Each structure stands twice: as C-alpha cells, then as structure tokens.
C-alpha cells in the first residue's frame, strides 16, 4: 500500500493523466520492476477505453509497490517529464516541508456546510437570534475544544426548569465553526424527555435510525422489536461510519439514558433538569450550571426585544418587580413580553398584579417553549420525586421567597436532630434546582418567587393555611444580615410577606 | 477445516489484507488447487467493494484448504511477498519454536488505538479512572496470560454481591495491551443473570450474534425459534471465524449456563456471586475470590475519591465505624460518597447514625451501580437458596456481627438424633454461595458475619422473628478482642449484651 500523501499526489495530478498518458506504456516497464502480475498487466492492457486503463492502472498500483517511485522513473523515460517532475515536487513538499493546510479553509462557504448541512442532519434547531449569553454559551464550547481527543465523555448542561438550557446548545453549535467538520466530525441531536421504562430505549432506537442515513430508511426492519443487546451492538455496528460524532441529548430526565450513553461509550451533551443523573456515570463527568438569568443580564435581554428601559425610580422598580417575580427565568420572561401588549410601564405593571394574583398561569402564553406555561413544565419534575422529597416540598410553600433562612428554622414546617430536614434540602435544590445551596455565614436555604408562584396556585387550600399554623406552633417556648437566633421566636419582619395569606 | 493458530494467523496479519489484497487475484489460482467451487468463485467475485471480496475469501477459505499453504503460494506470486512471508513466519513460531511467537511476531503491532475498537465491540464497559485495584487486577491478567495456550477454561472471579467483581474485569481487560490482540484475539462480553430456565439459552442466542457481525444482523431469522443442539452446533460453525476469542459472562447465577460453555469448550471468564457453579464443569476450574476491602486498602479508595483524612483519634474512629460498617464492600461505600453531601466528618458521621437504623436504606443512592442499595441486590442471592438453607439464614441475625464464634454456639438458634454437624453444614454452604460470614478453621472451627451482611437482615426479617431468635438464644445458654470466647464462660453471652442492647 502507498499511504494519504502518496495517493494524495495520484489524485492532484489528474487532469494531467487524463489529458496524455497510456497505461500500456507503463505495463512493460512494472511488470520488470516486479510492481505487477502478468494477469494484472494484461487485466488492464485489454481494455476499452484509456479512463479505464487509467482507473484500473492507479487502483492497481497503489497495492503493489512499496512505495512511488517505480512510476516518476518512468513518465521521466516517457518523454513526460512534465507529468514526473508535478509528482517529485509534491514528494517533496510533504517529506521535507512539514507542512501543506491543516484542517481549515481552501473550500470556503462553510456556511451551509458547518451550517445548513452538517447541523441539519444532526436535527439541530435554529439557534437564537436577537439574545445570546456570552459567559456560558462561550464556556460551554471550551469545555468541548477541551474533549474534542478524549474518546468518551458527559457533559452535563444541568440547570432550572424552563431556564434556558437547549438554546445555549443549539447556538454554542451554531456559532461557531470549529465543533463541527475541526473539533467534532458530526452531529446527531434528540430530545429526550424519557419517562417510561421504555422511551430510554426507544431514545436510541431513534438515533440508531439518525445514524442510519439514506441508506435504507426504507428497508427500515422491525427495529420495534429487537433486544437492548442487539440494538446495542447494532449501533456499535453502525458506529464505524461516525467517528468523532457529538450526541446532544436535549432534555434528560431517566438516569439509564445515561447508562446508555456510558455503555455505548458515546461523546454526548446533555440538557437536564434533574442533575443526579450523573451518578450512573463514572466517567469524565463535567458540569455547567444554568443560573438564574443575573441581575444585568436580564436588563440587557430586556432592550434585546425591543423592551422600554426605567425613566424614573419607582419604575425600574416596578421592573425589579418583574425580575423579582421571575426569578431569574428566561421562559417565564418570554411569555411575559409575549404578553405585554401596549409595552408601557402601565401595561407591565397591570401584570406584574396579575402574576402576584394568578401564579405563572397569568401569563400563560404561546412563547416558543414547548410549554403554554412554566407550570405545565414543573408538574413534570415534581412526580419524579420521590414521594418523601415530594411531601417536604408543597410544604415550602408557606416561606419568604428570595430571603435566606436557616436550616431548624425550617424544620419546623417539614416532615419526618434535624439534619434529615438538611438532607432533603439539598436533595431538592438538585434535583430541579429549586432553592439555594449557600454554606457559609451559616447552613441556609432560599426560594425564588417563580419556584413559588408555582406552589402557591397548586398546593390544596387547607394545606397552606395548616404549614402556617404548623409554623406559629414551634415558633416561641422558652437586608444585608441574615436573621439570627437571638431573635428567631417572631417571623414578624416578613409578616409583611406572610400577610399575603 | 484449519484451527486456532492456523486462523489466527489471518486474524493477526489483517491491517495488510485491508491495506492491499484483491481476492479475485486468487480465484483463478484456488478454483485450480482444488479449495474452491465455480459458484463460490462468482460468488466472491462479483461483490460491490473488497471488505466483502476479502471477509467472503476469508471466511470461505478456512473451510476448502486442507491447511494453509495454497495462500502463502500466491502472495509469493503477486508481487505481494510482503505479505506470505509474515505468514510463512507466524506458521513458523507455532510449529517450530513455541513461545517466541508473541514477543516476536505480534508485538510490533500493537496498537492501543486498536483496544478500544476490540473492547467496544466485545461490549466492554468502560473501565474504571479514579480507583484501581492493583492486587486483584493483576493476578487476574496474569492468570489469563497463564492460559491463552489452553483451548477452553474457566477463570471464576466469584466474590461478594456488590463487592466490585465485574469492574476488576472491565479494568483487567481495559489496561494491558497483551490480553486482547497478543494474548487472546477478540472479546465478547455478556450479563447472565439467568434466574429463568430459559435465561440461559437466550444467553447463547445474543452470543451467537455477538459473534455474527454486520454480516446480517438484517438477516438475523427467527432465531427465537432453533433447537439447543442447533443453536449449540449453529455456534461451533461461526466459531472458525473467531479463534482464540474470550468471553466474559459478568454476573453468572444459573449453573447451565457454565454446562454450555464447557458444553462449547470455551474460553471464558465469569463474575459470580455464587461458587459453587463450578461444580458444573470437570476442567481447569481456577478462581479469584474477591475478599471484603482491605483495612488499608479502603482508606486508598476514600482519598481517591476527594475524602478527607483523620486529623484527630476519635474521628479516624468514627471512620473505622464506617469501614466497620461496610464490611469491606465497595458498592456500598460508593452510595456513600455519592451521599456524603458537606463532606465532614461530621455529615459522614451523621451516615453512621442513619446506618445503625436505617440499615442500608439509609444510603440508598443513584450509584453507577445498576442497583440502588445493596439491598435491591441481594434480595437475589437470597432467592437462589434453599427454602432450607433460607431459614437458617435469617435467623442468623441475631448474633454479633465482626465477632467470631464456635458452631455449637450457633447450633441454638438454628433450624433442624443430636449431633449439630448439619449446622457446620449450612453454613459453609453460606459463605460459598454469595459469601456471607467466615470460613475459619482454627484455633477452632467458627464463622463470622460482617455488618454490611447484618444491616441487611435486621431491616428485612419479619419482626417477631428477632425476638424469637433471641429468646430461643437464651433458653439453651445455660444448663449444666484477639481471644476467641471459650466454653468455661459460654453460659453467658454478656460481653456481647453491649451489640444485644440494640434490639
Ligand atoms: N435568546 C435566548 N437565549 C436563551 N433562552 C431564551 C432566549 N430567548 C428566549 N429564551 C427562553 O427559553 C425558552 C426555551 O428555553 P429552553 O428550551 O432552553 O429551556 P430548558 O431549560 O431547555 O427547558 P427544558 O430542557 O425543560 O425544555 C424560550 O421559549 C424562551 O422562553
Ligand atoms: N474501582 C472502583 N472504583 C469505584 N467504585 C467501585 C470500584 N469497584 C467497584 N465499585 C463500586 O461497585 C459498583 C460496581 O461494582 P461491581 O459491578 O464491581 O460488583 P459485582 O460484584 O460485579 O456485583 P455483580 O456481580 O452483581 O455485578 C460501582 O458502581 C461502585 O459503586
Ligand atoms: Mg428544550
Ligand atoms: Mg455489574
């Protein structure tokens, strides 16, 4: 055999043995140099035409010499010097000079290549337009760079239900050019939402079938029925085509999912809600947290559709209303501009009264979420907790939203030393990310407004005035500052917030 | 036919037949020597690329030739001796000089690119990164290369349920370079758990695939429907293909399924929970037992995994009460870290209180185990025994765990002339069939049982029975530290009324 260079310099000199060179010329002179056989040489000197003395001569020749030269000490001998002195040069700038492109750019219009056709194929959809998050779409596609060498390997885009974490995906793919065709040779990306014992399965009886390309979509077997082993080794099969290929596994919620993907050994994203799913990984498992949209950022999300930015005080206030209330989420942002109708101050604000008076479901919108309203999305990553997590929960409920609490102090609603209370906590601001994991001053917790709103138009009615009774029963016996303990027997500063019941 | 060596030297110099080798060359020349059919020329001849005209000439060969000559023969004659002579040197260390033939030629390819391939496809998982056991994984491999030679075995890595069995494989396997291309060929790699009479047919039936590759899997018939024998000898044919191949069959329970292996004469490795399914094969039987993890050992799995070390005394102690805890077992210890949360001494320390009473389902986590506690595990190795070995089992709670005891003071709690050397019985068959207590010989003969296989029992057995053990303790006690407990003081269990008192 020859090699890529050398079979390289066969395929750039081409219309040149096209335009003058028989092969029969050559035939004599290798079957001496012993670079032939006798069928070989009369296999290709009766033949029709030259294009296939000529295609049957340089397939034939790449498998016989040790390597090219017995081929430019010939077109030399041939009066076609002009052809052996182009195939020395290329000799020459690949074993003296090392160099000649590196993958990059002598075909340009990637545009619809990196673009259009590589991302279609991978069932990438549209990235964003009008916003972009620097600081995380930017991060993510370092930590890929990072890995585009190792063979296997998790990343995990966990974050907050609604909270934008696809986009982030489908721009850090679409924005830039070097993942796809440089970093990562192709893509293929399915949205998950696994909650049967089945769907983890079908997953990848689908992305089986997104391997699989035109070649028989028709021929399509009863792939419905075929063991998990078969499928597996199957796609272990169908993995020879792809190599460097990127999975994006929009929206994980079955942890075998991932079982899966490490079985498989698979290069894969993940967008996911619940973030434990990584346990089942024991692996190259690296993370970026989705936070809630910061304090200027949301402003700048703001004026990106075109939304009117605070003349006065008490205006921008009456937007820090808003950002109060959506504490931090793009999603239940999205059905808000959706829905400010005018686009005044007054029209934001006439809403700002119904969300405080209707929940999410006072928004609830056509937003290009698969969701009318944030609630119809929670209700999902609420059943999947387990029926302990899940009593401990709707009893946050009676809370200060977006105020930090000590850990007895919320003892004291909760179900069951009061370090299980602790342990459920963390749990939750985990697994859907729900509250506020903060260690130091002292061990507290948090609970956004939108992570309530939820609550609050969904928890039975008695079930809230009972937390609340539950709450005065303990409380007595014998600002920048969290509240301490020599004060804890009255919650009386947030009886403001507690009038609200 | 042509055999092991004689197909394994195609399997070794295949990187050349992919590089430069037309099939059609050698029609001619083989439809003439006589190791060819005018039907299967065409039948070669005419496919659309060469991987096919090259795994068609392959496959079809090692069944004409009545050995492997009429090949070095002509790629001498196709300007392709660079090829017959790799060969001619390969039949050379085979039949000549044993031995020489994998440092010499086999090594000087070696390619670590080329494991991972091997090992995706013989459906490896992923070996494991942040721990390895070194003591273990390598007597395993060594074992192995011990027996490349023999032309069927059976290495039992058989050990605790959970203890960490199969992943000493998957790293085994993963990390010399010798095992897969030198030493053995090809792997393939399958679960058991056939509880079902009928799990472990199936088994055979996904191996049999395993083997058939791209070579329809589209064609796969109905083989759901195929007798044992056929399958068995439908088998031994796609064997030629893959000589010196090995198995992993990771977590065996059904005893068939070593019948059929040793039925097949394959080299294979097992990961058991229980032994005894050796008994099964009358063969080079050889076996790694897994023991519970080393006092010193443990403390190397917690650092490597960012666990934080003893600073003071009573607090490398309220460590010792976790390894003391989980007698020794990995998957246990792992539900831990993952459930560590803060990463103190203290978190964990509160984990040794949910422990004492919580049992395991106090640790209960999203491991990479494919269980969530060791309970959900066990409950099997359970199931598998005797209704009659069941029963004195459960009772057996009721005892010190990490204390070692005679067997007449066993004999009173336990299930049933008058000599108690059934009960001796009962419990060797324990600790061999998911290893459950402590094969003891001397000073004198006495078991033991672990707290990992004690927390497990006390959360699990029906109430009453605990009181009923131990008042059936009681009854016969009486009548007429590194110091096992004699019989001048047997009457009385009061040392050991401090464990009692949890109860
Ligand atoms: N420019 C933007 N960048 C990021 N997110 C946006 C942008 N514009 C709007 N969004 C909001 O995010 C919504 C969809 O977000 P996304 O699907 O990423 O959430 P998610 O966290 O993936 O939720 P899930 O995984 O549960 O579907 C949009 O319909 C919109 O409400
Ligand atoms: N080297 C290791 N590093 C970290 N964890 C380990 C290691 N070995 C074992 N474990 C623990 O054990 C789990 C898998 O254990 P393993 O599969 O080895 O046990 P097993 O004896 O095979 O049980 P079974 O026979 O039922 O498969 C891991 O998910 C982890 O919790
Ligand atoms: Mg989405
Ligand atoms: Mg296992």
Redesign the pocket.
């Known amino acids: 055999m020859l090699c890529e260079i050398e079979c390289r310099a066969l395929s750039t000199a081409h219309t040149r043995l096209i335009h003058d060179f028989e092969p029969r010329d050559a035939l004599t002179y290798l079957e001496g140099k012993n670079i032939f056989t006798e069928d070989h040489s009369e296999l290709i000197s009766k033949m029709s035409t030259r294009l296939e003395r000529i295609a049957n001569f340089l397939r034939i020749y790449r498998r016989q010499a040790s390597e090219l030269g017995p081929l430019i000490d010939f077109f030399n001998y041939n009066n076609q010097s002009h052809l052996a002195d182009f195939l020395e040069d290329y000799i020459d700038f690949a074993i003296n000079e090392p160099d000649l492109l590196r993958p990059v750019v002598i075909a340009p219009q990637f545009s619809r290549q990196m673009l259009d056709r590589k991302l279609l194929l991978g069932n990438v959809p549209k990235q964003?337009t009008?916003?972009?998050?620097e600081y995380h779409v930017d991060r993510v596609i370092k930590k890929l760079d990072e890995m585009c060498d190792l063979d296997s390997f998790f990343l995990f885009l966990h974050?907050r239900?609604?909270?934008?974490?696809?986009?982030?995906a489908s721009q850090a793919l679409s924005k830039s050019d070097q993942l796809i065709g440089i970093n990562y040779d192709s893509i293929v990306w399915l949205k998950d939402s696994g909650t049967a014992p089945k769907s983890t399965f079908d997953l990848f009886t689908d992305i089986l079938l997104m391997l699989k390309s035109e070649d028989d979509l028709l021929n399509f077997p009863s792939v419905e029925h075929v063991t998990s082993v078969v499928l597996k080794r199957m796609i272990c099969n169908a993995l020879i085509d792809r190599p460097n290929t990127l999975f994006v596994f929009?929206?994980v919620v079955q942890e075998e999912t991932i079982r899966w993907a490490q079985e498989l050994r698979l290069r894969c994203l993940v967008?996911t809600?619940d973030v434990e799913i990584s346990n089942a990984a024991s692996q190259t498992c690296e993370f970026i947290e989705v936070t809630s949209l910061e304090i200027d950022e949301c402003y700048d999300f703001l004026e990106a559709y075109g939304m009117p930015m605070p003349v006065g005080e008490k205006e921008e206030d009456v937007l820090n209303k808003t950002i109060e209330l959506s504490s931090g989420n793009?999603?239940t942002?999205?059905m808000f501009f959706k829905s400010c109708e005018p686009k005044t101050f007054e029209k934001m604000a006439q809403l700002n009264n119904k969300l405080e008076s209707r929940g999410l479901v006072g928004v609830e919108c056509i937003?290009?979420?698969?969701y009318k309203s944030l609630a119809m999305?929670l209700q999902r990553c609420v059943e999947v907790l387990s029926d302990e997590d899940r009593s401990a929960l709707a009893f946050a409920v009676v809370m200060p939203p977006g105020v930090d609490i000590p850990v007895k102090l919320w003892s004291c609603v909760i179900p069951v030393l009061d370090d299980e209370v602790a342990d459920r906590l963390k749990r939750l601001s985990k697994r859907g990310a729900l509250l506020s994991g903060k260690r130091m001053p002292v061990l507290t917790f948090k609970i956004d407004h939108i992570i309530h709103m939820f609550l609050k138009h969904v928890v039975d009615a008695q079930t809230i005035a009972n937390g609340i009774s539950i709450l005065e029963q303990r409380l007595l016996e014998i600002e920048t500052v969290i509240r301490p303990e020599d004060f804890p027997k009255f919650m009386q500063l947030h009886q403001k917030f507690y009038d609200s019941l």
């Open positions: 964003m009008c916003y972009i998050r974050g239900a609604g909270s934008g974490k696809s986009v982030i929009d929206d967008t809600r793009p999603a942002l999205m937003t290009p979420y698969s999305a």
